[PDB]
Coordinates of C-alpha atoms and ligand atoms in Angstrom, one line a residue:
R1 CA 0.0 0.0 0.0
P2 CA 1.2 3.5 -0.6
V3 CA 3.4 5.2 2.0
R4 CA 2.0 7.9 4.3
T5 CA 4.5 9.8 6.5
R6 CA 4.3 12.9 8.6
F7 CA 6.1 15.8 10.2
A8 CA 4.4 16.7 13.5
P9 CA 6.3 19.6 15.1
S10 CA 5.3 21.1 18.5
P11 CA 5.7 24.8 17.8
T12 CA 7.8 26.0 20.7
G13 CA 9.4 29.0 19.0
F14 CA 12.8 27.8 17.8
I15 CA 13.9 25.3 15.1
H16 CA 17.5 24.2 14.6
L17 CA 19.1 21.8 12.0
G18 CA 18.3 18.7 14.2
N19 CA 14.6 19.7 14.3
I20 CA 14.2 20.4 10.5
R21 CA 16.1 17.1 9.8
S22 CA 13.0 15.4 11.3
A23 CA 11.0 17.0 8.5
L24 CA 13.6 16.2 5.8
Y25 CA 13.6 12.4 6.3
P26 CA 9.9 11.7 6.3
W27 CA 9.5 14.1 3.3
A28 CA 12.3 12.2 1.5
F29 CA 10.8 8.8 2.3
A30 CA 7.4 9.8 1.0
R31 CA 8.8 11.3 -2.2
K32 CA 11.1 8.2 -2.7
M33 CA 8.1 5.8 -2.4
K34 CA 5.7 8.1 -4.4
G35 CA 3.6 8.4 -1.3
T36 CA 2.1 11.2 0.8
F37 CA 3.8 13.6 3.3
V38 CA 1.4 15.1 5.9
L39 CA 2.0 18.2 8.1
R40 CA 0.5 18.2 11.6
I41 CA 0.9 21.0 14.1
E42 CA 1.0 19.7 17.7
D43 CA -0.3 22.8 19.5
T44 CA -2.1 21.4 22.5
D45 CA 0.3 23.1 25.0
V46 CA -1.1 26.6 24.4
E47 CA 1.4 27.9 26.9
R48 CA 4.4 26.7 24.8
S49 CA 2.8 27.3 21.3
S50 CA 2.2 30.4 19.1
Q51 CA 1.3 31.5 15.5
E52 CA 4.7 33.0 15.1
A53 CA 6.2 29.6 15.9
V54 CA 4.0 28.0 13.2
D55 CA 4.9 30.5 10.5
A56 CA 8.6 30.0 11.3
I57 CA 8.2 26.2 10.8
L58 CA 6.4 26.8 7.5
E59 CA 9.1 29.3 6.4
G60 CA 12.0 26.9 7.2
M61 CA 10.2 24.0 5.4
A62 CA 9.6 26.2 2.3
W63 CA 13.2 27.5 2.3
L64 CA 14.4 23.8 2.1
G65 CA 11.8 22.8 -0.5
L66 CA 9.9 20.4 1.9
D67 CA 6.5 20.6 0.3
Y68 CA 3.7 18.7 2.0
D69 CA 0.7 17.0 0.4
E70 CA -1.9 17.3 3.2
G71 CA -2.2 19.7 6.1
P72 CA -1.4 21.7 8.1
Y73 CA -3.7 19.8 10.5
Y74 CA -3.8 21.6 13.9
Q75 CA -4.5 19.3 16.9
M76 CA -6.3 22.2 18.7
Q77 CA -8.8 22.3 15.7
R78 CA -9.5 18.5 16.1
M79 CA -10.9 18.6 19.7
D80 CA -14.4 17.5 18.5
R81 CA -12.8 14.5 16.8
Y82 CA -10.8 13.6 19.9
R83 CA -13.9 13.9 22.1
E84 CA -15.9 11.7 19.7
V85 CA -13.3 8.9 19.9
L86 CA -13.2 9.1 23.7
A87 CA -17.0 8.6 23.8
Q88 CA -16.8 5.6 21.6
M89 CA -14.0 4.2 23.8
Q90 CA -16.0 4.7 26.9
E91 CA -19.0 3.0 25.4
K92 CA -16.8 0.1 24.4
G93 CA -15.1 0.0 27.8
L94 CA -11.6 0.8 26.5
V95 CA -11.4 3.8 28.8
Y96 CA -12.7 4.2 32.4
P97 CA -13.2 7.0 34.9
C98 CA -10.8 7.3 37.8
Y99 CA -11.9 9.2 40.9
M100 CA -8.8 9.5 43.1
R101 CA 2.5 4.0 38.5
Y102 CA -1.3 3.9 38.7
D103 CA -2.4 0.5 40.2
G104 CA -5.8 0.2 38.4
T105 CA -7.9 0.8 41.6
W106 CA -10.7 2.2 39.4
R107 CA -10.3 -0.2 36.5
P108 CA -13.5 -2.3 36.0
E109 CA -13.0 -6.0 35.7
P110 CA -15.4 -8.9 35.7
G111 CA -15.5 -10.3 39.3
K112 CA -14.1 -7.1 40.8
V113 CA -16.1 -4.8 43.1
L114 CA -15.6 -1.0 42.5
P115 CA -16.4 1.6 45.1
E116 CA -19.3 4.1 44.5
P117 CA -17.9 7.2 42.9
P118 CA -17.3 10.1 45.3
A119 CA -20.1 12.6 44.9
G120 CA -17.9 15.7 44.6
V121 CA -15.6 14.5 41.8
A122 CA -15.1 14.9 38.1
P123 CA -13.1 11.9 37.1
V124 CA -10.1 11.7 34.8
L125 CA -10.4 9.1 32.0
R126 CA -7.7 6.4 31.7
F127 CA -7.0 4.0 28.9
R128 CA -7.3 0.3 29.8
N129 CA -3.7 -0.7 28.9
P130 CA -2.9 -4.5 28.7
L131 CA -1.6 -5.8 32.0
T132 CA 0.0 -9.0 30.6
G133 CA 2.5 -9.8 27.9
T134 CA 4.9 -7.4 26.1
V135 CA 4.7 -4.7 23.4
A136 CA 7.4 -5.1 20.8
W137 CA 8.3 -3.4 17.5
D138 CA 11.1 -3.7 14.9
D139 CA 12.4 -0.2 14.9
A140 CA 14.0 0.6 11.5
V141 CA 16.8 2.4 13.4
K142 CA 17.1 0.8 16.8
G143 CA 16.1 -2.8 15.8
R144 CA 13.8 -4.9 18.0
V145 CA 12.5 -3.0 21.1
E146 CA 10.4 -4.9 23.7
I147 CA 8.8 -3.6 26.8
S148 CA 6.8 -5.5 29.4
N149 CA 3.2 -4.1 29.8
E150 CA 3.7 -4.5 33.6
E151 CA 6.1 -1.5 33.3
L152 CA 3.4 0.6 31.6
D153 CA 0.2 2.0 33.2
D154 CA -3.3 3.1 32.4
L155 CA -2.4 6.4 30.6
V156 CA -4.6 9.4 31.4
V157 CA -6.3 10.2 28.1
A158 CA -8.7 13.0 29.3
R159 CA -8.5 15.6 32.1
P160 CA -11.5 16.2 34.5
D161 CA -12.8 19.0 32.1
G162 CA -12.9 16.4 29.3
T163 CA -9.9 17.9 27.4
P164 CA -7.9 15.1 25.7
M165 CA -4.3 14.5 26.6
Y166 CA -1.3 14.6 24.2
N167 CA -0.5 10.9 23.6
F168 CA -4.1 10.2 22.9
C169 CA -4.3 13.0 20.3
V170 CA -1.2 11.6 18.6
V171 CA -2.8 8.1 18.2
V172 CA -6.1 9.4 16.9
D173 CA -4.2 11.6 14.3
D174 CA -1.9 8.7 13.3
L175 CA -5.1 6.6 12.9
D176 CA -7.2 9.2 11.0
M177 CA -4.4 10.2 8.7
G178 CA -3.5 6.5 7.8
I179 CA 0.1 6.9 8.7
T180 CA 2.3 4.0 7.6
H181 CA 5.8 5.2 8.9
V182 CA 6.6 7.2 11.9
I183 CA 10.1 8.7 11.6
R184 CA 10.9 10.9 14.6
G185 CA 13.5 11.8 17.2
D186 CA 14.5 8.9 19.6
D187 CA 13.6 11.3 22.5
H188 CA 10.1 10.0 21.7
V189 CA 10.9 6.3 22.0
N190 CA 9.4 6.0 25.4
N191 CA 6.0 7.2 24.1
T192 CA 6.0 4.5 21.4
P193 CA 4.7 1.4 23.5
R194 CA 1.8 3.3 24.9
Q195 CA 0.9 4.7 21.5
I196 CA 1.1 1.3 19.9
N197 CA -1.2 -0.3 22.5
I198 CA -3.9 2.4 22.0
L199 CA -3.6 2.3 18.2
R200 CA -4.1 -1.5 18.3
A201 CA -7.0 -1.4 20.8
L202 CA -8.7 1.1 18.4
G203 CA -8.4 -1.4 15.5
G204 CA -5.6 0.3 13.5
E205 CA -2.5 -1.3 11.9
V206 CA 0.7 -0.4 13.7
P207 CA 3.1 1.7 11.6
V208 CA 6.8 1.1 11.1
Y209 CA 8.7 3.3 13.6
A210 CA 12.1 4.8 13.0
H211 CA 13.7 6.6 15.9
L212 CA 16.5 9.0 14.9
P213 CA 19.6 9.4 17.0
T214 CA 20.5 12.9 18.4
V215 CA 22.3 15.5 16.5
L216 CA 25.5 16.8 18.3
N217 CA 27.0 20.2 18.2
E218 CA 30.8 20.8 17.7
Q219 CA 31.3 20.5 21.5
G220 CA 29.9 17.0 21.5
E221 CA 26.7 17.9 23.3
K222 CA 23.1 17.7 22.1
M223 CA 22.4 20.5 19.6
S224 CA 19.9 22.8 21.2
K225 CA 18.9 26.5 21.6
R226 CA 20.4 26.4 25.2
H227 CA 23.6 25.0 23.8
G228 CA 23.9 27.8 21.3
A229 CA 22.4 26.3 18.1
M230 CA 21.7 28.5 15.2
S231 CA 18.1 28.7 13.9
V232 CA 17.3 27.3 10.5
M233 CA 16.5 30.8 9.1
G234 CA 19.6 32.0 10.9
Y235 CA 21.6 30.0 8.3
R236 CA 19.9 31.9 5.5
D237 CA 20.6 35.2 7.4
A238 CA 24.3 34.2 7.7
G239 CA 24.6 33.6 3.9
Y240 CA 24.0 29.8 3.5
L241 CA 22.2 28.6 0.4
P242 CA 19.3 26.3 0.9
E243 CA 20.6 23.7 -1.6
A244 CA 23.8 23.5 0.4
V245 CA 22.1 23.2 3.8
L246 CA 19.9 20.5 2.2
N247 CA 22.8 18.5 0.9
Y248 CA 24.7 18.9 4.2
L249 CA 21.7 17.9 6.5
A250 CA 20.9 14.9 4.3
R251 CA 24.3 13.5 5.2
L252 CA 24.1 14.4 8.8
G253 CA 22.5 11.0 9.8
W254 CA 22.3 9.1 6.5
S255 CA 24.8 7.7 4.0
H256 CA 25.0 6.2 0.5
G257 CA 28.5 4.7 0.1
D258 CA 31.0 7.5 -0.6
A259 CA 28.6 10.1 -1.8
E260 CA 28.9 13.6 -0.3
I261 CA 27.7 16.0 -3.1
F262 CA 24.3 15.4 -4.7
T263 CA 21.1 17.1 -5.7
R264 CA 17.7 17.0 -3.9
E265 CA 16.4 14.7 -6.7
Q266 CA 19.3 12.3 -6.3
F267 CA 18.8 12.3 -2.5
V268 CA 15.2 11.4 -2.9
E269 CA 16.0 8.6 -5.4
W270 CA 18.6 7.1 -2.9
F271 CA 17.0 7.7 0.4
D272 CA 16.3 4.6 2.5
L273 CA 15.7 3.8 6.2
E274 CA 18.3 1.0 6.2
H275 CA 21.1 3.6 5.8
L276 CA 20.0 6.0 8.5
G277 CA 22.9 6.2 10.9
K278 CA 22.3 4.3 14.2
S279 CA 24.5 6.6 16.4
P280 CA 24.5 10.3 16.8
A281 CA 25.8 12.5 14.0
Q282 CA 27.9 15.6 14.8
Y283 CA 27.6 19.0 13.2
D284 CA 30.8 20.3 11.4
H285 CA 30.6 23.9 10.2
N286 CA 33.8 23.4 8.1
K287 CA 32.1 20.7 6.0
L288 CA 29.0 22.9 5.7
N289 CA 31.2 25.8 4.5
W290 CA 33.0 23.7 1.9
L291 CA 29.6 22.7 0.4
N292 CA 28.3 26.2 0.6
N293 CA 31.4 27.4 -1.4
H294 CA 30.7 24.6 -3.9
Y295 CA 27.1 25.7 -4.4
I296 CA 27.9 29.4 -4.5
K297 CA 30.2 28.8 -7.6
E298 CA 27.3 26.9 -9.1
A299 CA 24.6 29.5 -8.3
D300 CA 23.4 32.0 -10.9
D301 CA 24.9 35.5 -10.5
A302 CA 21.7 37.4 -10.7
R303 CA 20.3 35.2 -7.9
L304 CA 23.4 35.8 -5.8
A305 CA 23.1 39.6 -6.4
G306 CA 19.6 39.6 -4.9
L307 CA 20.7 37.5 -2.0
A308 CA 23.7 39.7 -1.4
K309 CA 21.6 43.0 -1.0
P310 CA 20.9 42.7 2.7
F311 CA 24.7 41.9 3.4
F312 CA 25.8 45.1 1.6
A313 CA 23.4 47.1 3.8
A314 CA 25.1 45.6 6.9
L315 CA 28.3 47.1 5.4
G316 CA 26.9 50.6 5.0
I317 CA 26.2 50.1 1.3
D318 CA 22.9 51.2 0.0
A319 CA 20.5 50.2 -2.9
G320 CA 21.2 53.5 -4.6
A321 CA 25.0 53.2 -4.2
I322 CA 24.8 49.8 -5.9
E323 CA 22.6 50.9 -8.9
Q324 CA 25.1 53.8 -9.3
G325 CA 28.2 51.7 -8.8
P326 CA 29.6 48.8 -10.8
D327 CA 27.1 46.1 -12.1
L328 CA 26.4 43.9 -9.1
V329 CA 25.7 40.8 -11.3
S330 CA 29.2 41.1 -12.8
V331 CA 30.7 41.8 -9.4
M332 CA 29.2 38.5 -8.1
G333 CA 30.7 36.5 -10.9
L334 CA 34.1 38.0 -10.3
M335 CA 34.3 37.7 -6.5
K336 CA 32.3 34.6 -5.4
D337 CA 34.9 31.8 -6.0
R338 CA 36.8 32.1 -2.6
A339 CA 33.6 32.8 -0.5
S340 CA 32.2 30.3 2.1
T341 CA 29.1 32.5 2.5
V342 CA 27.0 35.1 0.6
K343 CA 28.0 37.5 3.4
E344 CA 31.7 36.9 2.4
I345 CA 30.9 37.6 -1.2
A346 CA 29.6 41.1 -0.1
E347 CA 32.5 41.7 2.1
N348 CA 35.0 40.9 -0.6
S349 CA 33.0 43.0 -3.0
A350 CA 32.6 46.1 -0.9
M351 CA 35.7 47.7 -2.5
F352 CA 33.5 48.3 -5.7
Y353 CA 31.2 50.6 -3.7
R354 CA 33.4 52.2 -1.1
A355 CA 35.5 55.3 -1.3
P356 CA 39.1 54.0 -1.4
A357 CA 41.1 54.3 1.9
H358 CA 43.2 42.0 -2.8
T359 CA 41.8 42.3 -6.4
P360 CA 41.1 40.0 -9.4
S361 CA 42.6 40.5 -12.8
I362 CA 43.3 44.3 -13.1
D363 CA 41.5 44.5 -16.5
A364 CA 38.1 43.0 -15.4
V365 CA 38.2 45.1 -12.2
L366 CA 38.8 48.3 -14.3
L367 CA 36.1 47.5 -16.8
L368 CA 33.4 47.2 -14.0
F369 CA 34.4 50.6 -12.6
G370 CA 33.4 53.1 -15.3
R371 CA 35.8 55.1 -17.6
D372 CA 35.2 58.3 -15.5
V373 CA 35.9 56.5 -12.2
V374 CA 39.1 54.8 -13.2
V375 CA 40.4 57.9 -15.1
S376 CA 40.0 60.3 -12.0
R377 CA 41.3 57.9 -9.3
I378 CA 44.6 57.5 -11.3
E379 CA 45.3 61.2 -11.9
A380 CA 45.4 61.9 -8.2
Ligands
LIG1 N1 5.8 16.9 18.3 C1 7.0 16.1 18.4 C2 7.0 15.0 17.4 C3 6.0 13.9 17.7 C4 5.9 12.8 16.7 O1 6.5 12.8 15.6 O2 5.2 11.8 17.1 C5 8.3 17.0 18.3 O3 8.1 18.2 17.9 O4 9.4 16.6 18.5
LIG2 CL1 23.9 16.8 26.0
LIG3 NA1 25.0 49.3 -11.2

């Protein structure tokens, strides 16, 4: 059956390379298998979610060409659906009210006597998790994982006001959206057994899970905002081209023999879960810089010119001063070859737009400065 993957970010306000890699891989797996890639926004923690955060996710995804086939589906807009499933579960006895790990004191069982519910209390609803046996899956990354159901408990699926809880919302979404493959950070591995049990109890087919190892920073710690990570659009703002960041990130957790340089289309054609790395990958800004230099040489000069404009401003060089100065498109072609970033292009090129206080072939340089400008500057 056709593949259906998803990217289901919680919008907490900051996205680094590690985060957007968890979009890249399910996108690539869907495109490789001619399947569907779904976008879901996990906003049920209203305290730690915002519209700004959502637009930044959409902007980073678009910058990297991670187009999605369905969505964005917002969990906070699916509360009627979640409530409907909870009512069905209660009718079928798959969830029960609790009126106080949890020890199942309020779990109904044939033969067991339950107390009368305390008159003053709105119960929480809990899922009837299996008490015997084990929950196991063949993780595409981690291999066979197996957990005793005795170690799990009867998950709260709804608060006393009836609001559904996070893990339950995930399962309903994965069911409703027909998800076949769940590729996500291994920081979610512990939620997997409880999700599997609910999904199965609801009648679904359990997807294939692939839990990605952490991404490390250059200090060998987990890449994170607190550890000084740059944001995805921070890379753009520092002069990195999207095609470079895409090629770099693809290889930060996945391999295909010796290959290091490849297009998006070739990545899609090659991508496979079997060659996801099984241990953490480590960021290396020198490697990213090499690739960015490579792609800068390859980039169209008029494109580079437009990307360069905000870096010239940062150097006290103005739109008007550029139009009046040497042709920027020609300047880009002449100066880009040594640059690791678009910012460096602009810095190396500022000499064409600054009053004189390092140069390519004298003749090309003179041609781009007008006749009038070269003539006068000599005489003095
Ligand atoms: N919302 C989670 C992903 C959950 C999932 O993929 O099941 C995150 O942002 O890390
Ligand atoms: Cl760490
Ligand atoms: Na000009």
